[PDB]
């Protein structure tokens, strides 16, 4: 398959779906360290942004080795955030619960 | 320190070797707070180093 190599630390992004049902798996469920991966049956939509609206300055370090950096910020400052539709999140978390109960 | 109450980013300035080897100029560039660490515990907490 065309594996997406995308890095992510605490949730998988843009991965492949599970075809028929929520599934749970681990090398050894008896011990905490072996991470209990889950491969969901439906996607959860996630959206993020950063509305500060930065701007690029250029600085000419040394012999022609330019270095970029955040210049002035035309706009108004705002927090950088991520959004998830809550009811779907609670539903899929609960269904992961039922499959965890199928294993626990 | 407090009138923002939102992650505004610092506004630091430094000296860079220009194209000439022994000429220099003052230049300014913003950095988000996690990239910058204070240099000493002195009351003069107005001299900073990159986290690297």
């Amino acid at each position: 398959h065309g594996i997406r190599p995308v890095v992510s630390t605490q949730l998988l992004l843009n991965g492949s779906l599970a075809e028929k049902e929520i599934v749970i798996r681990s090398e050894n469920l008896t011990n905490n360290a072996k991470i209990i991966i889950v491969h969901l049956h439906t996607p959860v939509e996630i959206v993020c942004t950063r509305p500060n609206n930065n701007t690029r300055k250029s600085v000419r370090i040394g012999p022609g080795q330019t270095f970029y950096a955040t210049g002035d910020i035309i706009g108004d400052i705002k927090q950088a955030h991520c959004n998830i539709s809550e009811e779907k999140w609670n539903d899929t978390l609960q269904k992961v619960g039922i499959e965890l109960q199928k294993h626990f | 320190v407090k009138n923002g109450t939102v992650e505004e980013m610092k506004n630091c300035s430094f000296n860079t070797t220009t194209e000439i080897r022994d000429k220099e100029k003052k230049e300014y560039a913003l950095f988000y707070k996690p990239d910058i660490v204070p240099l000493s515990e002195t009351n003069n907490t107005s001299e900073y180093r990159l986290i690297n």
Partner: antibody
Amino acid sequence: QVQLVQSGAEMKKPGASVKVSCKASGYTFTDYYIHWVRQAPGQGLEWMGWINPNTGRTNSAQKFQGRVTMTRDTSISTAYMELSRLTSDDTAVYYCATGGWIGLYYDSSGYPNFDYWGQGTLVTVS
Amino acid sequence: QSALTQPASVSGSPGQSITISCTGTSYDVGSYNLVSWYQQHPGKAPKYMIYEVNKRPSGVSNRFSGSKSGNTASLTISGLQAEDEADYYCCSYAGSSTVVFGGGTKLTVL
């Protein structure tokens, strides 16, 4: 409900400075932007500046930002216009107005949502 | 001068529809729905009528509506009335966190 009181008219000579105030009423001074537009007598309108009163931030116009040092204070519940190097052209009525709703996660200062406007008062100079 | 161009005046008898047009550029008004309309009857301060091209505040009847197209936008004035003899101003978001006002146009009831 909402009204905005402004400081009265005054006279000045060219090269002087002016500090017009704009006091709030009828709504929480924080949760809306505050606004200023300029109108020379018998002429069209014009824009001056924005303030997020919960901070010290300003968006002021390119032509007048050097000429403008507007500010605010929550204790008086008032936003202050300021002008310097005041030329004869600046003779005009200055209207204070309330902008879009302000909070987190987006910037509404661009929105020209002027729900309410102030008394408006005249600066004269020649 | 204003970035945004308006005609000097329009006129008509009561009971007839009238429309007015703003005109900017691809940037500024042309790129956003953030356009608004304000009326200045003589002497008093201006009045708030339309925001986001085609939405109304309270106290504005269904006589008024707006539209956008390209680098231009417009106001709709259906069924002119006797108290209408006042100016109308365009104003819109000019990018760069800045708002720009048009010179407006004078409507005259015959």
